[PDB]
Each structure stands twice: as C-alpha cells, then as structure tokens.
Amino acid sequence: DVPIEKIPEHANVLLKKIDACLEILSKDIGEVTDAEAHEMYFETSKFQILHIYTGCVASFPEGDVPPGAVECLPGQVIRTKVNGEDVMLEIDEVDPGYQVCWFKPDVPLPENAEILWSYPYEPTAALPTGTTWEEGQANVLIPAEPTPEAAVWPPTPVTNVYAPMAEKLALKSNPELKVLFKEALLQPAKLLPLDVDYQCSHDREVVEAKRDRYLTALVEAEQAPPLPFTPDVLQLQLEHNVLKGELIDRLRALEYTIVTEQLQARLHERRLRGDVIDEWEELDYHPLVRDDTYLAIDFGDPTFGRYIWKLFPHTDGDEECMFKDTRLDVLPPQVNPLNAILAQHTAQTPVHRSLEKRLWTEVRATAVSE
C-alpha cells in the first residue's frame, strides 16, 4: 500500500526537518566576556591593581628607579580607559635591559625615557577620558581565528545505469522516427544513391545485396528493444521489493534519530536565549542516553574509558578521544557481501550446472514468450 514514487516526498520532509535542526545546532556559545565573571582573575594577581587615569607610562633602561615612579612588572594589572573603553592591561614579557613605570605628573622623567602612552590634564573632570592609542603608537593584534573547513559527510556514489537507457527511450520514443520507418521501408529507393551505385558497379548483385542489407538493418533497428539484454523480471521485482523494505525501515530509523535531533535543537534554542539549563534537565532531552546513564548510576561504577577503547579500537591509547571527531577517519566499508556469497556459490558449483542454469533461463524466456 506504499508505492515507491512516494518515498522522495518523505525524504524531502525529513531533509527539511534535519535542516531546521542543524541550522540551530550549528550555532554554539562562545567564551564568556563578562568582567564580573573574571574580576577575581585580576583580584588574584601577584600585584595590586593600578587604577591609572593620570600621568604617563614610560619605558626606560634598567638600573636605578626614579623616586616616585610605580614599577610595572610582569603580572601587573592596570585598570584604564582606552578610546572610551574601560580595560584591564596585564603586563607580560617586558623586554630585557628595560623596565616600565607609571610616572605621575609630580614625578620628573629620567633621561632616555620613552613615553609609551600618556594621559591628558583633566583635574576638574569627574569621568576621565583616558588615552588615545593612535595607529603606530600601539600594535594591537586581533586573533585570526581561521574558520576551518566545515566537516562534510562523504556522499556515497550511486551508479544509475538506467538513466542513459531513459535518455535512449526519450530519443527513440518519437513519432517522426516511426514516420520515417513507415516511409523508408515502403520506398527505400529514395534514400540511397542507386543511380550512382548502378552506374559505377559492374555487378548488380552487389547493389542488390547492399539494398538487402539496408532493409535487414532497418527491420532489425525498428524491431530491436531499448535494452541490449533480456532482463529476468522476477529477479528484478524481487530485488525491488527487498530494497523497498530496506528503504522504508531506513527512513523509519532516520525519523527515530531525527526526533532526538529536534529535541537537542529545541533544548539548544533555550541555551541560545541565555537561559541556564540544569545538567539533568538537559539530560532529559537525551532520553536514550539518559536511560543508560541512569542504569550505570544504579550499578554504581563511575569508571570509563576502556569500554570506549574496545568498542572503537581506533581510540586506543587516545586519552583525549572524547574531544575529537574521527567518524570520518573510520567509516563503514561499502563492500557487498553478496559478491562473496555468489563467489562461494560458483566455487562450490560445477560448470555444467552453470550452463544448465543458462538453459533454465533460456527456457524460462521461451516459457514467458509462449
């Protein structure tokens, strides 16, 4: 009660569904940038935080420190305002033979000092302006973040032998070609250059056998079939019904997995809105893993890893197997066991039975004919 033409409609539906899933799941949450979440990273620095909004910062060679200058060693955190942006600067890898210090305006600068960046004079101002790092004053590097190639699943190839045959059918299935056959067999003298043939030809038997060959070639052309062989319709309907059932069961399994993908996507929608999801509330949206995980808890064995290294031996020795995706490195082979089965069948059978089977097929063809 389910014809084979109705399948691609179902495939279109499931493609729409999984695309609506993957367009959501392709998004992911980046690193958090809230300063309130990372203020303790600066609280726990090896030096107290310098709230610098006045004076200048200068680099000068190592040696005696000017009295009044605040050293800025590696690990020093500095709260400033840069081009209207409140920022924290963490000192890292000051060059050798040189040191950096904050010089308030009360402090005179030494000789051979280089002002890296300076602040303006704004004593009446309540909200200071900070600095303005011009192009060439500071080389700021944005991380490149080269987006690698999107992981594409390999499409398996499918040899369509019958599409050339469909094209040949579209070619032969014309009314004009049959009209030409109808007017060629009735009057083939029109086509051929018979007056020239009889003129040059010394024996009329050649011209007669020539026309008798063209007639037979035309009768064979019209009476030939689209195919070059005699298909056994029973074995083809057999393979068709088997492949149909395998396709319906495959579509049912894919819908079964799509349900879990549109569940993980319905949950990921909330995560994208900024809502915090509990670990177990999130596990409930993975019901099949939730069940097996709950049973592992019931048993009480929190260990893991050799089970993975046995089920997927390509991960053996890989401690960071969980943080990778080697499904493309390890794909199921496209080998047909039917070839090994027919090979063992031919190896067991003799040759006279193979020729007998050719006779059974020929007699079956004549039986279907009669």
């Binding site: 057999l238 049912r252 099949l288 046995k310 066991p337």
Partner: protein
C-alpha cells in the same frame, strides 16, 4: 581490555545498542555471544573410553534410527560408527576435554615406589583387557557446555533474581540454584509449547490473541506496541530458534532489547510519524545461513535471505505455509 573480546564487538553493539539506531537485529549476531564460551561437547560413555560426539556420528545414528532396522543390526552399526569415531578422535589427538582448564581425562594411574616394575610406571585399567572390537555404548552421556563466562553459576545473586523478575517467576528469599531450576522449568515449558505448536501446524494456525499471549510468555513483546501478524510470527521464529540453542544468557540479551522505551519531556515531540507500521514476514529471518562475526569497526550490511541462491527452493516450506 582484560575481559572482552575484540571480534564479538560489533555484534555486541548491534545487540545492546539497537535502541539508539532503531534498526532491527539479526539473531545470529546474538548467537555470536557464545564466542565468549568454549566448545560445547557431549561425551558418550562406553565400556572402554569416552568418545566425543560429532555431527557425522549424529547423522549416522539418525540415519540408522530412521532405517528402522532390527536391534541386532542397529547396535552393530552404532558400535561400528562408535569405533570409527573413536579412531578418528584418537588420530585427532584425543577428545577436546583433555586440553581444557577445569576439565580433564586422567592418564593411567602411577605405581608408587617398589610397586613400580622397572620401566612400567603405570597401571592401565581393567577395560584395557577388553578388545576394541567389543566397544559398546553404555547408554550414558555427559554434556559439557564449557561456559566459562556465560555459566549461570557465575552470574550472581542479582542477575538471576532480575532474570526471574523479567520472566515473572518467583525470586525472593531463595538461592540462585532454586531460581536457576525455576528458570530451566520455564525454559522447558516454552520448548514443549513450541513442539506442540509445530505439531498443531505452526504459528499461522494460531489466532492473533493466542500469538500475542505466546509472545508475552516469551517476553519479546510489550502491550504498548501493537505489531502486525507477520512481525509477531517473525519474532516468534527468532526466539524459537534462539531458545533451541539452550542458552539463557543470549535469550535474555535478545529479549531485553524489546523493552527499551523512553519518555519525552515535551508534548509536541515525538511528532506523529508519516510511514506505516513496521511489517515483516517469516521469510525475512535468516536462520538457514551462517554469518561470520563482523570485524571491529568494519560492520557489513544485512543481506536478505531472498538474495541468496536457491532461496525459492530453501524457503519453499515457509512459502507454502504462508501462501496457504
């Protein structure tokens, strides 16, 4: 890494994680779990030595039993096959039991001290005097499953109780031996019921409710499924063949796969499906063909029985039963 085997891995995955994929399972992949065990043997006890039973000897004995000969000829042919198999195994290197940890055949007893008569350090048994041509079967048999990992003894206090719960048997406040006997009695009942169904004309002679109740007794169906008749018949055939092998562990592994149901947290999801219900037939079950264990991380697709050569000939019984 110390306990599992790397060749049964893909079959293990297909048997225990098919609720993830939604694909059907092949019973032969559950039968592959017997690779954890050793070779199950059957020693026939004779008046001289024990002999390991083989498919050839069993075929000969079935042929002699089918010929319906006089007992004077029957016993003679049986003993001829017996001495032939004895010579065969003596050329093989003795029975399989000699070189298996936990089992063994003793050699001739030793002679201690002054009882040792020079070079003859041994004392053969009385039956060594009997000539080999008088080899006769005593009528006694010894079955040795050689279940080193599957045996019901090593299961434990919990697994047996849970198997009896799953089969709706009594389980509380009893030893694992008594629950084992209860399980074996249930198993015997199911086999006798299979025999009576085969006498009464198979599964197709049964009604729908009767088949539903049979599958509930076999513990392969839950009442929240509403399968078809062909699916029910195929399921029965599957578990019938699997229980013919007489192994509760693989039986339970097969049965438990049909009882992994989930609950969704949302009301809209899961959506109403578009495809029809899953339907099968008795023909879809491949029992008459062997299946090698798939190599780890190299699984092979499933071949229908119809694609095999001479399938219309092999399935002719099932074809006649279904078309009729």
């Amino acid at each position: 890494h110390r306990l599992m085997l790397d060749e049964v891995t893909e079959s293990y995955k297909e048997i225990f994680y098919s609720h993830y994929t939604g694909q059907l399972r092949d019973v032969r992949k559950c039968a592959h779990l017997r690779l954890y065990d050793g070779t199950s043997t059957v020693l026939l006890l004779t008046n001289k030595e024990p002999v390991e039973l083989t498919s050839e000897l069993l075929q000969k004995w079935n042929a002699i039993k089918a010929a319906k000969l006089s007992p004077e000829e029957e016993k003679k042919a049986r003993n001829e096959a017996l001495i032939e198999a004895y010579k065969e195994q003596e050329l093989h290197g003795g029975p399989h039991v000699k070189h298996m940890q936990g089992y063994g055949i003793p050699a001739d007893t030793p002679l201690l001290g002054e009882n040792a008569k020079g070079d003859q350090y041994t004392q053969p048994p009385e039956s060594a005097s009997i000539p080999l041509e008088q080899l006769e079967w005593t009528g006694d048999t010894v079955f040795i499953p050689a279940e080193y990992r599957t045996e019901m003894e090593d299961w434990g206090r919990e697994l047996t109780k849970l198997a009896n719960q799953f089969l709706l048997l009594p389980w509380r406040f009893v030893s694992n031996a008594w629950n084992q006997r209860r399980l074996v009695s249930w198993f015997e009942e199911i086999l006798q019921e299979d025999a009576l169904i085969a006498k009464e004309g198979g599964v197709q002679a049964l009604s729908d409710d009767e088949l539903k109740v049979a599958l509930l007794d076999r513990a392969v169906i839950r009442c929240d499924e509403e399968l078809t008749r062909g699916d029910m018949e195929a399921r029965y055939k599957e578990i019938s063949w699997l229980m013919s092998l007489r192994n509760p562990f693989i039986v339970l592994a097969w049965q438990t796969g049909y009882y992994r149901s989930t609950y969704s947290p949302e009301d809209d999801l899961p959506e109403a499906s578009i495809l029809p219900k899953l339907n099968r037939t008795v023909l879809d079950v491949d029992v008459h063909n062997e299946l090698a264990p798939d190599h780890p991380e190299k699984p092979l697709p499933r071949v229908h029985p119809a694609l095999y050569p001479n399938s219309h000939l092999a399935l002719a019984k099932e074809v006649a039963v279904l078309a009729k």
